[PDB]
Symmetry: D2
Subunit: 103 residues, 4 copies
């Protein structure tokens, strides 16, 4: 339920950042995974969330797994990253201070 | 449509697009390579690989902002053609 | 040179370039953003961030292949200008 | 001596792939590290080397460290990847079969 898999090149970067912010607020943590050319997105989302102050990372892992590839006959290999983030202590404030609602 | 490759598959290997572009040049002479957002890097890489290795030359390289079904995304369109050293590099590869 | 940002620093945060572009628009109205090879993705992202959030509009978006001191690299050049909603988004940000 | 740190945007992808092939032939293994927008390069180099058959990965790690940032006054955070590869059993053959030298 709190999993985001980046692949669709039609989506804007902020879709994922905001989708992660949601899942974090709703579920405390969030998972972010991506393959090959999509790892840049998850990398950038994490840098954004960490820097602006929303979250802290709990696990950051990149592996090389196999992928079913009917064209090549036998599976090819791709880099896959998996990043679990959890809400930071400043998250609630930020998800309000930007809206002038910070109590 | 037959000579246009759209890069939008994160599972694919870089070479699927480099080799597909080479197979297309063999057929149609030219080949179009396009992509949105995060996939532009791949098209960029493909082109650079083909330019540098001497397989081809570019004819058109255009980047524009398009509306997606509004959300805007960068889209690059690259048209390549076989270079004078193509057929030999292929017969030797 | 004062209104041109060249993205070529892997240590920098995405926002250093988004915010720098916003500070430049405040000064010169427009702002040029350029990059080679792997850095084109960042320029692509910067632009998309500014287009979507409503800060600005593009004027020029060109990608070309250039010789580096020959080795070829893709280079993108993007010129932006403040959008009619700029000053308000900045005074509110 | 067998370390490659990707940063320079003027370099072609094949510079790194071939530099890694060299360090591997010379030193058995090779290290490949990169920050943020440069992780895509190391990711692609590894996929290339693994797929074409040159190497096997021994360690693949992405972390979020601090970086000195005089402009922001206090360090920002960036993603950093580190990938150690070692020569595969097919490496020697490939670094010859392509040259019609495969004995
Ligand atoms: K309030
Ligand atoms: K096609
Ligand atoms: K400047
Ligand atoms: K021989």
């Amino acid at each position: 339920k709190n999993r985001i898999q980046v692949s669709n090149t039609k989506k804007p970067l902020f879709f994922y950042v905001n989708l992660a912010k949601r899942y974090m607020q709703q579920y405390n943590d969030v998972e972010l995974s991506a393959l090959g050319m999509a790892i840049a997105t998850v990398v950038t989302v994490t840098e954004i969330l960490k820097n602006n102050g929303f979250a802290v990372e709990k696990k950051i892992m990149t592996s090389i797994v196999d992928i079913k590839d009917d064209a090549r006959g036998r599976p090819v290999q791709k880099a896959k990253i998996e990043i679990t983030l959890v809400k930071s202590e400043k998250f609630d404030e930020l998800m309000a201070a930007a809206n002038e609602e910070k109590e």
